[PDB]
Amino acid sequence: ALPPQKIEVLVLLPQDDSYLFSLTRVRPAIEYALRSVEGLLPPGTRFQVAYEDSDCGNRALFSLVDRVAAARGAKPDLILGPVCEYAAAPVARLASHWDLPMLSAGALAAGFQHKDSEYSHLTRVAPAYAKMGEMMLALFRHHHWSRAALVYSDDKLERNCYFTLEGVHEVFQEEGLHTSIYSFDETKDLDLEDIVRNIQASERVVIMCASSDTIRSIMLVAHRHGMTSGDYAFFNIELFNSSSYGDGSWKRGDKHDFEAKQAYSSLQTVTLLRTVKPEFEKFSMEVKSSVEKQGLNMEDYVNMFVEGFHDAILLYVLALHEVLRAGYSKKDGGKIIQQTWNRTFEGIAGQVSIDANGDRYGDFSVIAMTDVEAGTQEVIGDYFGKEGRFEMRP
Amino acid sequence: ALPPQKIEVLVLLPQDDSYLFSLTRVRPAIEYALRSVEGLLPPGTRFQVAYEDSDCGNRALFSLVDRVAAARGAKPDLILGPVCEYAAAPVARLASHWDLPMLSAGALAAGFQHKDSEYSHLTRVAPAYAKMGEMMLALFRHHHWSRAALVYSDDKLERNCYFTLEGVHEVFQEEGLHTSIYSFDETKDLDLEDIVRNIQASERVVIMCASSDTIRSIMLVAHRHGMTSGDYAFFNIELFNSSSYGDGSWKRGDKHDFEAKQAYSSLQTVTLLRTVKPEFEKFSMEVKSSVEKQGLNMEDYVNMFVEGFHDAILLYVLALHEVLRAGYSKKDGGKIIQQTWNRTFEGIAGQVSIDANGDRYGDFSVIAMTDVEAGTQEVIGDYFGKEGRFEMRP
Amino acid sequence: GCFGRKMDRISSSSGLGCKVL
Ligand SMILES: *[C@@H]1O[C@H](CO)[C@@H](O[C@@H]2O[C@H](CO)[C@@H](O)[C@H](O)[C@H]2NC(C)=O)[C@H](O)[C@H]1NC(C)=O
Ligand SMILES: *[C@@H]1O[C@H](CO)[C@@H](O)[C@H](O)[C@H]1NC(C)=O
Ligand SMILES: *[C@H]1O[C@H](CO)[C@@H](O)[C@H](O)[C@H]1NC(C)=O
Ligand SMILES: *[C@H]1O[C@H](CO)[C@@H](O)[C@H](O)[C@H]1NC(C)=O
Ligand SMILES: [Cl-]
Ligand SMILES: [Cl-]
């Protein structure tokens, strides 16, 4: 045994609840996972969780640095988040500089891939984009296609889709697959007509990314052009709020509800394979009941972010346990981090695996339109990251 | 009436003298201006300068942070640098957060142009790229040109040439001129033939940016394709290094020297319109002297960066004087910065005018070949930022 | 295309212009 520990963690997420991973939403996950870890660590150990606002931007680098200064030079033992690409950069870098471990269910951009230096203390629990591109690459090697057009949106602020398709690119690039790139700003004036024109100009297979509503518009504009008959193959990445199917992702209670249903017939959606388990149920229930008595409703099943942070917590308490046993202390940041890499464990929803680079393996699903008359949408296939194998559902 | 002041200055530049703005090459300039200034401010006032290696990267962020956090929570009174684009962003952000005034002869990219918030405390004493672009935009209106190609090297690291042409692009895209982009890594293998061929596809007016040698390469190949001589109008920006915009640019004591002179008959160079005066001569003598006394092989003299930081100090001092008159203190960076904005003062080389946005107005000149036989390259015309008039010479 | 061989400095500021070969 050893004396009771006193772990200080700095959580950095956006207070703004308009984000799938805001504090209000992630906190419940952390606390839960924290109540389960106790009773791996010396009896009596405690956790002092500071929830600061990231504003999904600079603020994080600010709050982190001010604390470290006010505290007269003392830094936290664990840093969770940020999740936003631009915000997770400096914090990550500084964490590496200070030998502080940083775990995050965000920071999915392909740049955090190179952890030989800059991002050496970063461990990613959610599937990076590159992973999703490893899948598309596989999916592509299946239909035997070799060319593709990447059509995405770019707000020059958060650029979620820019980074998203960047993964498809980084991967398709290495393998040689040819790629046509077309970007546009949805927020600003939409000239969808152009999009479609270039599409019907470049390739016959298209991989898109933009707000669900923007994808609809593009699907219609192209439908009216009779491109939705079987000459083209449309795809759109929707990894976090993919649940509209089973009800109809085209349906909107809108008048265009019919054209939409038609066009979407040629539209396949790639999302995350979210497995369940009794545990996960109880977790989901409790996390839901909290966010709710807070003024927010939840998307039925907790999102991948909430699940990830829960598992993040464990993964840390799992590595601090091994580091301790060997003799070192919590202050040996890199040591801890190295423990969190290249391993497999039981998360709140099932198996979880972090590759030898500190990036979690991902599992994705593809949704298509099984019965056109009705507009029935169902997963036609799964792909398994670690395994490295794709497969059509029964 | 006032007590002796002790300004704590934090200079952030590269230790490596490969940069036209290394600490060793800039320190003298700073000290010189310091003497002249320490003899405006209260008697007994003393400057404490801290020269720290920016490393043109994250180092600059780390140093600043480690300095402040370590020794209390006391930040410096004035930060000088960094110059490098990527390394100035954080330091500038952290400075605008701590209400600290930040002056630099770099950070010329178009992003630091938005100061309604994150760069509120940044003043640029050297001509930004967007001004250099406003220059081109006038040259283009002059010749009735409305289209252009932007060919540049993109190392995906420091990326100076990319930021350079980004300025031209920002200005053109707004005014309506159409452009065609084209990037290549010059760190890798140069497919100079493809480049030249795409050029043959695009526009007749070509804006270029790359290593002095690379512009020459392309020039030979284009020449080989007969694209030189009247057909296309090549351009290339060389704003700082005198060894590059100096007459005989095409020479290399190489076998191609004849051919090169032949190609450059169509290549026009864009650089800064540096002025001089008696006092500047004294300055250059000492700066030259100090640099050599440090072993550093005298480049040629003082670059825009050196002359820039010298006038940077006079600018800070002029502003302190005034702010220290309205009943404010050295710790009110904001009040100090707004004082350095929208004004004109005497630098070592002459007039210096900062616009109402914290950006130094820039005056440019164009270098063309006036005798194909000889190889003579004299200045054809100039542009004056503030006035905004481009004028051809006799 | 608009991605270049890499994007090393992802998460810095550079987001005012694309790339392409
Ligand atoms: C200033 O510009 C000159 C070119 O005008 C640069 O000199 C060249 O440097 C490269 C790489 O160091 C050499 O391969 C060439 O031989 C050099 N050209 C010659 C003959 O001088 C120089 O590097 C630049 N200086 C700075 C500040 O980087
Ligand atoms: C800039 O300062 C001058 C004084 O030198 C003043 O007359 C002018 O109105 C200012 N410009 C603005 C509006 O910022
Ligand atoms: C995610 O998108 C779905 C529909 O695609 C929407 O119902 C949900 O509100 C979105 N998430 C949030 C909470 O903004
Ligand atoms: C995981 O992969 C890494 C790759 O270097 C290897 O060192 C390690 O042995 C593997 N994990 C184990 C212990 O099986
Ligand atoms: Cl965040
Ligand atoms: Cl610098």
User: Could you say which structural class the secondary elements and strand pairing of chain C correspond to?
Assistant: little secondary structure
Q: The biggest beta sheet of chain A, please?
A: 8 strands, mixed
End-to-end C-alpha gap of chain C: 6 Å
Structural class based on helices, strands and sheet pairing of chain A: alpha/beta
Main interface by residue count:
A-C, 23 and 14 residues
How many DSSP helices of chain C? 0
CATH class of the largest domain in chain A reads Alpha Beta
Shape of chain A: elongated
Element-by-element helix/strand order of chain A = EHEHEHEEHEHEHEHEHEHHHEEEEE
Helix fraction bin of chain C: under 10%
The radius of gyration computed from the alpha-carbon positions of chain C, rounded to a whole number of angstroms, is 8 Å
- Which shape of chain C, going by the Cα principal axes? flat
* Rg calc of chain A: 22 Å
The set of bound ligands, ions and cofactors reads: a molecule of 2 linked components (NAG-NAG), 2-acetamido-2-deoxy-beta-D-glucopyranose, chloride ion
- Taking strands numbered 1, 2, ... along the chain, how are they ordered across the largest sheet of chain A? 7-6-8-9-10-13-14-15
